[PDB]
C-alpha cells in the first residue's frame, strides 16, 4: 500500500509498504530518496514519535496516511 | 520595529501550521505558546 | 553553506537550513514532552 512522508520542505514523497513493515524499514527507504541517514530521521504521526522497532500497524498507519519527517538536529 | 515583528511573525506562522498537522489532537493555542517559547550556525549542523 | 560544502546536493543544504532557522525540532521536542 502507499503511504506518504512529508519531507523537510513540506514536500510529500510516497513509499510502498506493508502494514507489518517496521519504522526501521521505512527509515531505510527514506534514506534512499532523501539523503538523510536513519539515525538523523525522526518520524512523527498522530502526535507521536515513531520508534524503529515497531511496525506501521502498531501506530494505526493505514493506506495513504501521512508521516512527518523531522531532521534530528 | 513594527516590521522585524512582522518578519519574526511570518516564519512562526509556517512552523505553527506544521506543528498542528503533526499534533492534530492538540489545542492550537497551546502549540502557539510552545512555539513562541521554543528555541531558534545550526544549519552548519 | 554552499561554499562550506561545495559538493553537497544544493537541495539537501536548503532543506537543513529551513529546519534550524525554524527550530521545528525543539518545538517538536516540547510538544512531545507534554504527554510524558
From Swiss-Prot, chain A:
Residues the UniProt record annotates as site (Essential for function): 68
Domain Ubiquitin-like: 1-73
Post-translational modification as stated in the protein's UniProt record: Phosphorylated at Ser-65 by PINK1 during mitophagy. Phosphorylated ubiquitin specifically binds and activates parkin (PRKN), triggering mitophagy. Phosphorylation does not affect E1-mediated E2 charging of ubiquitin but affects discharging of E2 enzymes to form polyubiquitin chains. It also affects deubiquitination by deubiquitinase enzymes such as USP30. Mono-ADP-ribosylated at the C-terminus by PARP9, a component of the PPAR9-DTX3L complex. ADP-ribosylation requires processing by E1 and E2 enzymes and prevents ubiquitin conjugation to substrates such as histones.
Covalent cross-link (Glycyl lysine isopeptide (Lys-Gly) (interchain with G-Cter in ubiquitin)), residues: 6, 11, 27, 29, 33, 48, 63
Site (Interacts with activating enzyme): 54, 72
Residues bearing PTM Phosphoserine: 65
Domain of life: Eukaryota
Intracellular or extracellular location(s): Cytoplasm; Nucleus
General function of this protein: Exists either covalently attached to another protein, or free (unanchored). When covalently bound, it is conjugated to target proteins via an isopeptide bond either as a monomer (monoubiquitin), a polymer linked via different Lys residues of the ubiquitin (polyubiquitin chains) or a linear polymer linked via the initiator Met of the ubiquitin (linear polyubiquitin chains).
Protein name as annotated: Ubiquitin
Protein's organism: Bos taurus
Stretch of the intact protein here: 1 to 73 of 128
From Swiss-Prot, chain C:
Localization terms from the record: Cytoplasm
Domain CUE: 1-36
Protein purpose: Required for vacuolar protein sorting; may be required for the consumption of transport vesicles containing vacuolar protein precursors. May bind a Rab GTPase such as VPS21.
Further comment found in the protein's record: Present with 4280 molecules/cell in log phase SD medium.
Organism listed in the record: Saccharomyces cerevisiae (strain ATCC 204508 / S288c)
Protein name: Vacuolar protein sorting-associated protein 9
Entire-sequence positions represented here: 416 to 451 of 451
This protein's encoding gene: VPS9
Domain statement: The CUE domain (Coupling of ubiquitin conjugation to ER degradation) is monoubiquitin-binding and is required for intramolecular ubiquitination.
Oligomeric and partner information: Homodimer.
